Amino acid sequence: AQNNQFIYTVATSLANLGTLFTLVNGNAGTALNVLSATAANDFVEQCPSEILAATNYEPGASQNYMYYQFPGRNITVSDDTVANTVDKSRGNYIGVTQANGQQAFYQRGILCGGPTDAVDMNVYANEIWLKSAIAQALLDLFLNVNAVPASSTGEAMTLAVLQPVLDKATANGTFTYKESAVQQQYITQVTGDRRAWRQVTLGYWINITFSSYTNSNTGLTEWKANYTLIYSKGDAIRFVEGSDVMI
Amino acid sequence: MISQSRYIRIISGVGAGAPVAGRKLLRVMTTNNVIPPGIVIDANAVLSYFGAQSEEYQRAAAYFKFISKSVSPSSISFARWVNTAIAPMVVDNLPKTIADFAGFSAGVLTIMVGAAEQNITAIDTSAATSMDNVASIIQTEIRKNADPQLAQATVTWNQNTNQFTLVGATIGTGVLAVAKSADPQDMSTALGWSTSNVVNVAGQSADLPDAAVAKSTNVSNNFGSFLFAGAPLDNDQIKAVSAWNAAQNNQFIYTVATSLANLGTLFTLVNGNAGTALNVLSATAANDFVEQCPSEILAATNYEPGASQNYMYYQFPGRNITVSDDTVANTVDKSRGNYIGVTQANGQQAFYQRGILCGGPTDAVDMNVYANEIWLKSAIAQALLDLFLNVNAVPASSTGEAMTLAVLQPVLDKATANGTFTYKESAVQQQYITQVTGDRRAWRQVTLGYWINITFSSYTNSNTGLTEWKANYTLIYSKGDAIRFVEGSDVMI
């Protein structure tokens, strides 16, 4: 119900996983973690929560939820076919793999949700942080300055206040300055201004509206500000392929 | 407190998020009873799942070794062909059978339905010497029931995978299922029955190959160049399957293996029938299956620069020689047979000889152009579907044609680099192009390698009286053909 505010971690067995992902399909912000039956509790649904809690949004803090090691938690799956079956249900687990004799890490950073919502957890966390930071800056502006006029000075002042947050966002890693034609057409359609996609070189595009309206509660006309922000999400590489041609 | 949304409201989302998959290019239709009829299933995985003795591992081992002259396939698929009549089945992918059915010695209840409930008496497996004993004990308790399906039902256990399978007594018709009950001592979870995704197979008749391949393509069609690979098929069955393949214009390939004498018998039935390949075997020799050569070459291709390739000059050291005389090769080429030929080149002696497909004048005889057209169709369809799924709406005006052309531009840009567009010398083709397209000077353009048009007309569909619009596009490009013969004269002085 709340768009991009919280996360919700659930712990399931392997057999129960198939029963879920039918009920909780969609439902953005929900994470499923597979337990091990007939073993110690070694609670595992806390891994995404711990990784989110430890983050400090200092430079290079975007991070990645996939390649990370949990020596306390015990192994969950060890076959490729079992992992293939589990990944269909968007289950998160600790997998073990052989790398020249040595054998375990969290395997997927995916969330259940629709096409419009953030499937990866890192972008989910970054959007949480962006919403909180923007709301804090705007509320602080409202609380401190005497009044915000509904004229050109208003847009200038609002943009000036929002500037430091967007400056910090580039350093954090939530804005990536990244290669599609379909996305280009979508951007040119959503924003009347063309050449916005070329700008999103820098990583973001921001607009301010300042329209007027009448609220339903009282007949009086009250104004309002509408802003639109577009930025390139931060996605991490997960697969490597190559060919070594000799001679 | 009053919620903060009364004063500041922010909505977060992902734009153009609709993901559309990319088509991949082998699938084998076997008959062994391991594979359930209604499913389709990255070499060691094949070895583990099927065992060392099976022909599936034999095929995968030779399939997964390949270099393609640009340094591999990296995937394979299997589907099930219902050769004969089958009884209903219920088939357990999770690792189980750690010999820990203990605690189910307390009067186990399980419920199964043909059309009405059947409850099974107390089943005690505390002893449980092995899972074979567990399956036997389950079978003994099930066989006590008076329902005809359950009178002679069988329970089996598989070690390579981790599957329990239940087979009903009658053959031909019946529907079986298992239900999750609320009792504490219910073993539908220790067994993988009625948990997660379980394949319930209803009874079937002898069935036919062309219907089987259609059923298999119903569930997923991310493949190219399928083949049956069991016992040799009858000529009529090959004819029916080739006709079914020809029904879809330029989607799949179909590889057949024949003897030399049988080759003349074919090419009469399967003449035309675009997308069919014939490969000649060697009698009284090792199997060294050869119908996989075009399939392997297609699978290994990655559509990176210079990937057009050529199916003619390529070497297969595993396969044994087929023909060695010029007259025999002349007779074979009349039937459009593909083979491994041996020729002397200063002492050294073997390579695939022809890359031709059986088909009509309108269809692609060479296999390279066939593969490139498969890739073009898949890429264009993917781009258009992705456009439909992401953007809000596509207006039926000048902006519509501009946007569609802009979206299709990168695919055509990549096509030039791949080698499927050649920028090549006829007058007849010139006149054909000037007639088909009202716009003259299109043939001069096809300097660049392609010509594209967009229409955006309107019409009314038959299903509803409403007028629905539509877009019509025409694409012309120069196909990629490779040189195959060299002739010259050296004049001295």
Numbering used by the authors:
A (entry chain M): 253 to 309, 311 to 356, 358 to 431, 433 to 434, 436 to 456, 458 to 504
B (entry chain D): 1 to 25, 27 to 42, 45, 47 to 75, 77 to 96, 98 to 309, 311 to 356, 358 to 431, ...
What did the publication describing this PDB structure actually write?
Bacteriophage E217 infects Pseudomonas aeruginosa and is part of an experimental phage cocktail developed to eradicate P. aeruginosa infections in Galleria mellonella (wax moth) larvae and vertebrate models. E217 is a PB1-like Myoviridae of the Pbunavirus genus characterized by a ~66.2 kbp genome, significantly smaller than the classical enterobacteria phage T4 (~169 kbp). Here, we describe the structure of the whole E217 virion before and after DNA ejection at 3.1 Å and 4.5 Å resolution, respectively, determined using cryogenic electron microscopy (cryo-EM). We identify and build de novo structures for 19 unique E217 gene products, resolve the tail genome-ejection machine in both extended and contracted states, and decipher the complete architecture of the baseplate formed by 66 polypeptide chains.
We determined cryo-EM reconstructions of the extended and contracted E217 sheath at 3.1 Å resolution (FSC = 0.143). Alkalization or spontaneous contraction during purification, observed for ~20% of all virions at neutral pH, triggers tail contraction. This results in sheath compression, with the pitch decreasing to 265 Å and the outer diameter increasing to 250 Å, while the rise and twist decrease to 22.1 Å and 30°, respectively. A secondary structure superimposition of the E217 sheath protein in the extended versus contracted conformations revealed that the N-terminal arms undergo significant movement, with an 80° rotation around residue 24 upon contraction and a maximum displacement of up to 20 Å. Sheath contraction results in a dramatic quaternary structure reorganization with a ~17° clockwise rotation of the β-sheet and extension of the β-strand #4 that becomes nearly straight C-terminal of Gly14. This results in striking compaction and contraction of the sheath that expands in diameter, exposing ~500 Å of the naked tail tube. Upon contraction, tail sheath bodies come into contact laterally, forming a much tighter lattice that releases a large amount of energy. Because of the increased diameter in the contracted state, sheath subunits do not make direct bonds with the tail tube, whose only point of contact is with the gateway C-terminal extension. Sheath subunits make extensive lateral contacts in the contracted state, providing the energetic contribution that makes this conformation thermodynamically stable.
